[PDB]
């Protein structure tokens, strides 16, 4: 349903984007969540263009077609984490689905 | 000719019929004040007040036509309120009924000829065309719409 | 598509009269169709009393709201006008006329004369 | 409640002249206006509907005009068959009240 | 806004257990809430969602667990509960409790809209053996 890159790496201070792919993305926008091992995850991206309170303005999401992505510029050491893409399993369905996620390593 | 009187004018037939709760008008005004529902269309400005709460007894659409547009703050923020003459008060008890009806009105709004005629129609003609558009789809069954729910404002 | 009317000729004051309109060649169940009633006192112009739409809703002129009732029956193609407590002033010619799609009285009956004793 | 005024109270015309009648609304009724003519002892017949559109079977010499609250009917080359009582009807909202009308007499 | 989960533990295959989630700082009554799970070393999968008063307390379950898990709420005590029966090895993992809201962009969205997770708790670990 929703396929993500197995893993990516970015150099400290550089800009990378992580791409989420799937078939349900033509009709509904994906949301993005970040989880650091051992801590509860913090919410990162809401709908089309809505950053919730408590989140820095260093990154944002975008989506079109059958693609969705999150662009993170100037990544710092605290950003090493698993990123999860979530959307609908089928267009018009009431069930939500999470993908396998992406491990982001920052050196 | 303020927005609060417009809310009361369109809420009145739903409270009398029992489609919404008696205190519905207060919940929807508070919702509009916290999160405005004005839309700037490429044609004519439209407002879609709705509460999405559990106060409403059943699903209904109440349509008002204004001769003198009123400034509603935009849904998508922006600094310029949109003058609105057409008001769609939306009642329903689930997230899905409100979203599907929102999609239906979206398809209605982008029909330029419908909106252009809509600006000059009597209340009964509005009733007939909206009733037809609602019944044409296989979805949206169970939403009440009557002649009493289409009115002109002054 | 001919409209026909029937009712009392000479009636006594304060009773209720029942004026019946028969339809032929036209179906009252069709979307957008409806029928109304027109009153014309002798020597005067015409005034609107009431009409019914295909969905069986009702509208009455407020000034005489308390004295007008209409019973619609699609079966047998009939419309029943009941007018209560008839006064002397209600002597007039009555007409049955179709409201019409797009709002115009395209088909009219020959009319009937109602005289209050 | 919408009231309506018919003007002039009466008109006086001869055969072959062009005459006009006016119906003025007390509120904005758009184009929901129709014109009818009644002959003595006969049911009124329809002349024009939707303010400007001529009905089938009605001669083209009848023409509606006006805007907003004030509408009019022009009748050119008046013939013997056209004399009688003229009425306007407004379909904006119930009650569908009528104007007072005018009697057009042969001189 | 704080959500603290409890009730996790080790259960043998075929057993049952009741989990509980305390949510405070943001009201239970009008907001949908969702359960999500994570087997160790694997990504997330959705478990199920409980709707609010206007939907008749309807519950939408994930396909791999539909018909086996029950999600319920008790507002009179303000707790969310999940009752699991006949668990198998694939069900092991850390279970998270979540708040749910609605999102729909009027011009570009599709019915029945999208659902947004407003926050998540730390989770309770459930193991099988
Ligand atoms: C909605 O608000 C705008 C902004 O105040 C109004 O536009 C102003 O109208 C005044 C006239 O009263 C002008 O002097 C300003 O220059 C206008 N500003 C802008 C940005 O347009 C508008 O008329 C209001 N509309 C309604 C229906 O209230």
């Amino acid at each position: 349903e929703l396929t993500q890159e197995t893993g990516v790496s970015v150099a400290l201070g550089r800009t990378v984007t992580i791409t989420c792919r799937g078939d349900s993305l033509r009709s509904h926008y994906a949301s993005w969540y970040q989880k650091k091992p051992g801590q509860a995850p913090i919410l990162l991206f809401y709908g089309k263009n809505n950053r919730p309170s408590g989140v820095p303005d260093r990154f944002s999401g975008s989506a079109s077609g059958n693609r969705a992505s999150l662009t993170i510029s100037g990544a710092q050491a605290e950003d090493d984490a698993e990123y999860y893409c979530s959307s609908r399993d089928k267009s018009g369905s009431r069930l939500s689905v999470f993908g396998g996620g992406t491990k982001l390593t920052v050196l | 000719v303020t927005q609060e009187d417009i809310i009361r004018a369109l809420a009145s037939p739903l409270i009398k019929d029992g489609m919404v709760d008696e205190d519905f008008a207060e919940y929807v005004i508070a919702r509009e004040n916290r999160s405005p529902t004005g839309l700037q269309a490429k044609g004519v400005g439209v407002a879609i007040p709705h509460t999405l709460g559990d106060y409403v007894r059943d699903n209904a659409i109440s349509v008002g036509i204004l001769d003198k547009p009123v400034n509603f703050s935009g849904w998508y923020q922006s600094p310029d309120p949109v003058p609105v003459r057409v008001v769609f008060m939306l009642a329903g008890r689930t997230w899905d009924d409100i979203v599907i009806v929102l999609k239906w009105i979206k398809d209605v709004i982008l029909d330029e000829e419908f909106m252009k005629r809509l600006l000059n129609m009597s209340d009964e003609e509005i009733y007939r065309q909206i009733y037809t558009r609602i019944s044409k789809a296989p979805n949206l069954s169970g939403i009440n719409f009557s002649r009493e729910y289409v009115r002109h404002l002054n | 598509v001919t409209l026909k009317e029937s009712g009392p000729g000479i009636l006594q004051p304060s009773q209720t009269l029942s004026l019946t309109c028969s339809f032929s060649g036209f179906s009252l169940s069709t979307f957008g169709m409806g029928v109304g009633w027109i009153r014309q006192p002798s020597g005067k112009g015409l005034e609107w009393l009431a009409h019914i739409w295909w969905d069986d809703d009702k509208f009455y002129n407020p000034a005489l709201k308390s004295r007008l009732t209409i019973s619609k029956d699609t079966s047998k193609n009939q419309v029943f006008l009941k007018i209560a407590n008839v006064d002397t002033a209600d002597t007039a010619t009555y007409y049955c006329a179709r409201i019409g799609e797009d709002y115009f009285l395209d088909v009219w009956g020959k009319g009937t004369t109602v005289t209050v004793s | 409640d919408i009231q309506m005024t018919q003007s002039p109270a009466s008109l006086s015309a001869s055969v072959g002249e062009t005459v006009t009648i006016t119906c003025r609304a007390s509120g904005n009724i758009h184009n929901y206006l129709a014109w009818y003519q009644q002959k003595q002892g006969k049911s009124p017949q329809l002349l024009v509907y939707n303010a400007k559109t001529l009905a089938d079977g009605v001669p083209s010499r009848f023409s509606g005009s006006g805007s907003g609250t004030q509408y009019s009917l022009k009748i050119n080359s008046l013939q013997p068959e056209d004399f009688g009582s003229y009425y306007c009807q407004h379909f904006w909202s119930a009650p569908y009240t009528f104007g007072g009308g005018t009697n057009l007499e042969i001189k | 806004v704080q959500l603290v989960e409890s009730g996790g533990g080790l259960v043998k295959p075929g057993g049952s257990l009741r989990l509980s989630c305390s949510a405070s700082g943001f009201d239970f009554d009008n907001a949908w809430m969702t359960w999500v799970r994570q087997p160790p070393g694997k990504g997330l999968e959705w478990v199920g969602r409980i709707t609010g008063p206007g939907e008749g307390w309807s519950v939408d379950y994930a396909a791999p667990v539909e018909g086996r898990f029950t999600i319920s709420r008790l507002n009179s005590i303000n707790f969310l509960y999940l009752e699991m029966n006949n668990l198998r090895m694939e069900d092991s993992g850390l279970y998270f409790c979540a708040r749910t809201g609605k999102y729909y962009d009027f011009w570009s969205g599709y019915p029945p809209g999208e659902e947004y997770f407003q926050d998540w708790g730390r989770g309770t670990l459930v193991t099988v053996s």
Side-chain angles (χ1 to χ4, degrees):
Chain A
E1 290 176 345
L2 298 59
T3 299
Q4 294 110 326
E5 311 296 90
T6 50
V8 82
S9 65
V10 62
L12 191 44
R14 281 289 53 63
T15 301
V16 156
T17 198
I18 182 46
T19 300
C20 179
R21 305 302 305 239
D23 297 69
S24 68
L25 295 177
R26 332 308 291 261
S27 294
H28 307 44
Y29 293 3
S31 296
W32 295 86
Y33 309 123
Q34 143 177 310
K35 82 164 289 183
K36 296 180 291 290
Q39 179 217 42
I42 42 171
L43 203 182
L44 252 60
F45 189 80
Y46 180 11
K48 182 181 261 182
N49 267 97
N50 187 325
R51 182 176 294 106
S53 297
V55 190
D57 261 337
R58 160 183 70 273
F59 58 90
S60 211
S62 316
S64 68
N66 77 78
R67 185 179 67 72
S69 64
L70 181 32
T71 300
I72 301 169
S73 174
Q76 319 63 49
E78 64 271 11
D79 322 316
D80 63 6
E82 298 176 352
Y83 288 84
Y84 285 130
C85 177
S86 67
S87 98
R88 313 305 326 177
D89 51 290
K90 322 166 57 68
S91 174
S93 173
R94 289 193 174 183
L95 329 174
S96 186
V97 158
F98 290 88
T102 59
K103 180 155 226 293
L104 174 63
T105 45
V106 78
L107 295 323
Chain B
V1 295
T2 195
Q3 106 296 359
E4 293 182 352
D5 291 296
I6 292 167
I7 302 284
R8 210 148 287 99
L10 290 291
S12 34
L14 298 125
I15 55 167
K16 165 281 172 182
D17 212 325
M19 299 306 80
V20 303
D21 258 26
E22 184 38 60
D23 38 8
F24 176 81
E26 311 81 299
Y27 292 118
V28 72
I29 182 59
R31 166 65 171 166
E32 187 61 14
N33 174 231
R34 291 193 304 275
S35 95
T37 58
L39 293 50
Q40 178 67 69
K42 64 155 260 283
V44 65
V46 53
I48 178 146
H50 64 102
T51 176
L52 61 61
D54 299 312
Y55 333 102
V56 286
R57 290 224 268 270
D58 205 342
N59 330 313
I61 303 168
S62 177
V63 181
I65 307 300
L66 311 193
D67 292 334
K68 183 175 178 175
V70 284
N71 261 345
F72 282 86
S73 324
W75 189 296
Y76 294 90
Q77 197 220 308
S78 78
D80 55 356
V82 48
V84 174
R85 57 184 56 256
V86 58
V87 180
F88 292 87
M89 158 90 78
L90 260 174
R93 34 173 163 90
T94 82
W95 287 10
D96 289 18
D97 325 298
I98 297 168
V99 170
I100 187 64
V101 178
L102 289 203
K103 190 267 188 187
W104 173 83
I105 173 159
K106 181 183 80 175
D107 324 290
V108 172
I109 215 82
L110 293 307
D111 170 338
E112 295 64 348
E113 183 63 23
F114 180 74
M115 212 57 209
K116 192 43 185 175
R117 290 177 292 219
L118 181 58
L119 299 160
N120 298 306
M121 321 200 159
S122 302
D123 54 357
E124 293 188 1
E125 187 64 20
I126 280 177
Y127 175 76
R128 289 182 187 85
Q129 290 183 34
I130 291 172
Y131 176 82
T132 299
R133 286 173 182 269
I134 293 168
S135 293
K136 177 172 311 304
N139 208 12
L140 313 92
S141 313
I143 65 173
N144 291 327
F145 186 63
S146 66
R147 292 173 189 272
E148 187 215 0
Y149 296 172
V150 179
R151 68 183 331 277
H152 300 92
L153 301 305
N154 60 299
Chain C
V1 53
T2 86
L3 316 179
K4 173 63 181 37
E5 327 101 310
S6 86
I10 299 169
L11 59 139
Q12 190 298 133
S14 85
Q15 272 49 88
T16 299
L17 81 172
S18 86
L19 315 82
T20 312
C21 185
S22 296
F23 300 79
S24 59
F26 141 72
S27 36
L28 183 69
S29 68
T30 296
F31 181 80
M33 291 266 178
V35 63
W37 286 117
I38 293 191
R39 185 173 69 178
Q40 145 174 71
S42 211
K44 302 295 185 182
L46 301 97
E47 60 182 356
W48 193 260
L49 285 289
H51 66 274
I52 310 94
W53 288 110
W54 69 103
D55 55 67
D56 203 37
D57 258 31
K58 308 185 290 267
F59 307 174
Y60 304 80
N61 154 283
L64 327 164
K65 86 212 169 293
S66 65
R67 299 190 298 112
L68 267 299
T69 298
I70 306 90
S71 176
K72 176 179 260 191
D73 190 357
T74 301
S75 42
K76 310 172 284 318
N77 277 357
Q78 312 303 20
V79 175
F80 308 149
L81 247 174
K82 263 82 62 192
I83 270 165
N85 261 287
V86 190
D87 204 334
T88 168
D90 214 330
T91 295
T93 300
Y94 288 77
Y95 302 89
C96 180
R98 193 171 297 153
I99 300 291
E101 189 294 339
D102 220 299
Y103 311 107
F104 48 83
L105 288 299
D106 53 351
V107 201
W108 294 69
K110 72 196 181 273
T112 185
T113 58
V114 153
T115 36
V116 182
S117 42
Chain D
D1 60 332
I2 275 283
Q3 317 308 334
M4 174 152 271
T5 87
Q6 214 32 63
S7 178
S10 66
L11 174 131
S12 175
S14 296
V15 51
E17 61 178 291
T18 299
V19 305
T20 279
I21 195 54
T22 204
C23 180
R24 182 182 112 81
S26 70
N28 189 346
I29 81 175
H30 296 264
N31 292 318
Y32 292 86
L33 218 39
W35 283 126
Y36 299 82
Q37 68 181 20
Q38 183 176 41
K39 266 161 299 173
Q40 180 66 42
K42 304 294 185 182
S43 299
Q45 161 182 15
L46 182 174
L47 330 177
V48 54
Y49 60 114
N50 203 329
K52 297 177 280 279
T53 86
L54 71 143
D56 286 357
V58 180
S60 66
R61 50 185 186 223
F62 285 77
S63 178
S65 320
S67 69
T69 62
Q70 166 157 355
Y71 298 88
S72 201
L73 201 175
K74 176 218 63 45
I75 195 53
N76 81 38
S77 40
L78 183 57
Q79 300 184 307
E81 293 82 2
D82 295 316
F83 311 73
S85 298
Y86 290 89
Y87 293 99
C88 59
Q89 266 154 11
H90 95 295
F91 290 134
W92 179 250
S93 66
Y96 294 8
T97 318
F98 305 172
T102 44
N103 303 7
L104 165 149
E105 54 290 353
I106 300 169
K107 274 299 317 183
Chain E
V1 66
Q2 54 283 47
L3 276 68
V4 56
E5 302 88 86
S6 69
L10 62 95
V11 316
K12 294 181 179 179
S16 65
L17 64 162
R18 189 181 191 200
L19 314 84
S20 173
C21 177
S22 292
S24 182
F26 271 147
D27 80 75
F28 294 104
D29 38 357
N30 41 31
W32 294 5
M33 286 186 348
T34 300
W35 287 84
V36 314
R37 69 184 185 186
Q38 186 174 28
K42 259 49 184 183
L44 303 178
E45 63 159 349
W46 187 98
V47 177
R49 181 255 311 289
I50 181 162
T51 62
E55 310 61 19
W57 311 112
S58 294
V59 314
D60 285 344
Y61 296 101
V65 298
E66 178 148 3
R68 296 189 301 114
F69 292 13
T70 60
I71 298 166
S72 67
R73 189 204 292 83
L74 303 320
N75 235 347
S76 66
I77 55 136
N78 278 187
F79 277 22
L80 178 71
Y81 297 89
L82 211 160
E83 278 304 5
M84 264 172 305
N85 295 288
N86 56 32
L87 315 86
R88 54 221 171 180
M89 291 334 305
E90 171 59 340
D91 292 311
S92 299
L94 177 63
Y95 284 2
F96 295 96
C97 179
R99 205 177 292 276
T100 303
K102 185 168 73 69
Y103 186 80
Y104 176 111
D105 185 289
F106 192 37
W107 284 319
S108 65
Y110 263 54
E114 297 59 9
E115 288 93 300
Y116 162 71
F117 292 93
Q118 215 177 50
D119 209 336
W120 297 352
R122 213 191 295 101
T124 188
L125 179 66
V126 83
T127 62
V128 182
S129 179

